Amino acid sequence: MLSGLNHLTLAVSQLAPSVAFYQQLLGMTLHARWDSGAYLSCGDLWLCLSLDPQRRVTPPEESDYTHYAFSISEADFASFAARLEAAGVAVWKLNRSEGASHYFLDPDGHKLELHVGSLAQRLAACREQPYKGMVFF
Amino acid sequence: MLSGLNHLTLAVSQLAPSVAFYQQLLGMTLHARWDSGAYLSCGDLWLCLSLDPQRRVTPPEESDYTHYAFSISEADFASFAARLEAAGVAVWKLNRSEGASHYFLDPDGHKLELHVGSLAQRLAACREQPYKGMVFF
Ligand SMILES: CCOC(=O)c1cn[nH]c1C(F)(F)F
């Protein structure tokens, strides 16, 4: 069967600023780069940045809710979010509808998130403050 | 410091067919559903389906290369690809890279992939045959 995400590939319009964002600003590990892409890791996540002439820099009001959340500890969350804010990283959402999260944009408008907590923790929180019509299996 | 992918959220235009696709066709575990979304798991992956009227059913020629690859063993790959083919799931690309890959579309046109092989396997292959302009770190 399927077991886990093998990799996440993000199309990027300009490779160098995107590599810098994920490696320098977000602290991911850069393993390789080439004329048309880069491979990074974030813990056990394999991230590929793929230079794509079709990628457009997309304002958040023009894209749907598809988004990518990265895990961060409760101890590190607030200072990392504040550092992104002070660095001028654009945002896309403010209301915490799914727990402790910070919503921010990459250089091409990919919708990213810092989140504290696992799926198990989110299900437990939802039992007390469920979403409308929620059923648990 | 970021420790991995916390969750992947896909915006969907119709919740019921998307739940059917990810749970029944792709075999992911459904943990909860509410009027506007669902939580599933696939190995370590936390997947959220979020009902979003802004989601367009998007032909693959009209979206960029951003895509989501799921892990499967080599031994299971061919029968899973055949299951998708029997279900009429469209393919958006042929494999031309190392490691088995099957490139398929979800009901809204999200670009998915089945892939066999890790980042370490890819890096080893690239060291032997580097892409144009490739540098390692
Ligand atoms: C850590 C300094 O970097 C930034 O503030 C920033 C903001 N957007 N991209 C960056 C980058 F690429 F330099 F990492």
Ligand SMILES: CCOC(=O)c1cn[nH]c1C(F)(F)F
């Ligand atoms: C793709 C090889 O280039 C690199 O790894 C790299 C890293 N900083 N700058 C480069 C450059 F200029 F070659 F694009």
Ligand SMILES: [Mn+2]
């Ligand atoms: Mn989220």
Ligand SMILES: [Mn+2]
């Ligand atoms: Mn891929």
